[PDB]
Amino acid sequence: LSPADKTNVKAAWGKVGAHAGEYGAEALERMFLSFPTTKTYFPHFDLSHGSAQVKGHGKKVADALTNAVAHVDDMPNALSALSDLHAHKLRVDPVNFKLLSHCLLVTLAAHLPAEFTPAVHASLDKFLASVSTVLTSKYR
Amino acid sequence: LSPADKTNVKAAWGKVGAHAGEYGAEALERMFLSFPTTKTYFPHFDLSHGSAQVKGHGKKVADALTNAVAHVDDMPNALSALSDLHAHKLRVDPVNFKLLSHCLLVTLAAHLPAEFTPAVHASLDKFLASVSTVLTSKYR
Amino acid sequence: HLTPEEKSAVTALWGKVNVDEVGGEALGRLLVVYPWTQRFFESFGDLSTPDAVMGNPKVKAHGKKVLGAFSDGLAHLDNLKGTFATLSELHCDKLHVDPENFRLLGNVLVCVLAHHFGKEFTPPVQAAYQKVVAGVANALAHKYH
Amino acid sequence: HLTPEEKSAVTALWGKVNVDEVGGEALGRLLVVYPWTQRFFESFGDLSTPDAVMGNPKVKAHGKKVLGAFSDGLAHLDNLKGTFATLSELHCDKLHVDPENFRLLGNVLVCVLAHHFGKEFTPPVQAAYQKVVAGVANALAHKYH
Ligand code: HEM
Ligand code: HEM
Ligand code: HNI
């Protein structure tokens, strides 16, 4: 992650702002529709369009990423609480992280065209891969 | 990574010793036979079982790996020189790093059985994957 | 396999696609986002800076050929293994492109379609195109089996 | 597939492979090395630590079933589709197992063969078992592909 990359992520997340929850909810929905394999982690969730729990979960996933863009250098400390939920008890296959990342990029591409430039796209994809890795670092 | 995972690597690579270059060379040898495509990354090479060169870079990989064990925390910093060559110059596909890491695990399982336990395996596989991720994190 | 509605929504969106640029944007974004893929295009020239990759007239000209092959896949969804038989042999036996890079390009194309169509590239429209790009990746990797 | 000399080497090596603890070790190690694979085996009880996985009777009994399926695939190498014609539509639309884990399980079995045979599991012998595990993984990833 070069110093130019973090400028691009923050600038793109700067146009995200209040719509973070909305974009997180859509990314999740795109993941549920495009990859029904990911629904297996939510049999206790109402997986219908416009669900307040997908909207609410969208906000939690988005805020966690807002927290990651705010804490640029050395992320394993801030997402340690999150690494024990995903990996230690629910044990989610790391491919699903690649799927949500792509669905998150498809969301940002559709909503922020002027800000989704090749350079930003690469900076965000790398950021989501680094978040994915930090979220997959401790496995028993 | 995990603290319990960075104890097993010491034990495994500590019992490897001076003939690390053979353990490294064998893994290379195993890769070209099991995976054809991997041949392209060496166009001026005629490496059959007993070829003089195969032990040279076999040592280079093994010595780069011992550097990584002593520098488990500062791994992206200690192996910074190789990250450039594997990126900017060669541009090796991340998949081929997974092909060598596997053949390397096979070699350790073959020569060190009383060491290659499911827990040590799980940690060595976590180590090599975190090594690959360092050698590939440079192209932009 | 695509439902009748999925087949309709895919052909509907595709007809609106700029066959002259999308392929170039998709190929270009692949080389910037996953730069190890630049190993198969060293004979293309300037690929250092991101603006050089996109502005490259050969990356643009080749992307058009790649787009054409996806259009062919779309026209014949029931015969993907057949449509990409020569290209599977070309990519697998001559080029030695790892099949994982076909999945990445298909995903980059999906990102390019979302970028050009905005809210018109809805989650079920994406869900349908994911089936398509997955089908094209598997068919282009068939010679490795 | 591969040369009959490699087909002879695979059959000769498998003749020395028990029926067993090899499968139990393979399934067990897949669960240890890739802890996400534990989700499909929730009914198996405790797995919390590597020793709990290796010491699980449900694990070793299931490992036998896995190796027993590989044995049948090795019996009919000429047609991997017709043998894994009862196992592919068991793991995909029901168990919801990502086809990537099938590659890891095969690659882990290859490590277990090296752990058991050592010097005897020579590199060209590994190459034959590699094409085999790739075939099995490909055949097990038949539907939704
Ligand atoms: C365990 C991971 C790996 C490590 C630690 C590693 C380490 C090294 C080291 C220390 C060198 C010596 C650099 C020099 O030339 O002075 C080297 C060279 C090289 N490595 Fe790696 N390597 C790894 C994986 C790979 C893979 C997967 C490939 C490609 C299939 C690869 C291809 C090469 C090539 C091509 C060279 C230089 C030889 C030439 O110029 O043709 N390496 N590597
Ligand atoms: C599903 C995705 C893909 C499709 C539909 C596709 C399609 C094509 C087509 C139609 C050609 C032109 C062949 C010719 O002129 O004879 C081509 C060429 C080529 N492709 Fe692909 N390709 C795909 C993915 C890739 C990937 C991922 C790479 C690697 C980065 C790649 C590397 C090449 C190269 C190096 C050529 C040069 C052959 C030429 O001279 O045209 N392709 N591809
Ligand atoms: C496919 C599975 C899956 C993936 C890929 C994934 C990927 C991600 C990524 C990757 C970029 C991020 C930033 C992220 C963030 C979060 N996830 Ni994830 N999660 C996943 C399945 C979940 C589940 C399931 C929960 C808990 C749901 C619940 O009921 O609280 C979860 C919960 C969260 C929470 C809320 C935990 C809490 O209540 O404190 C955050 C934040 N996440 N998840």
Ligand code: HNI
């Ligand atoms: C990580 C998940 C996973 C993988 C990679 C995997 C990979 C493999 C591979 C090689 C790639 C083979 C040959 C194989 C063979 C078998 N598996 Ni798999 N299985 C897996 C998860 C299962 C589960 C789970 C079951 C039991 C299903 C259930 O719900 O009881 C299963 C059951 C079996 C059975 C028992 C069939 C029956 O019910 O009679 C065989 C045989 N298999 N599995």
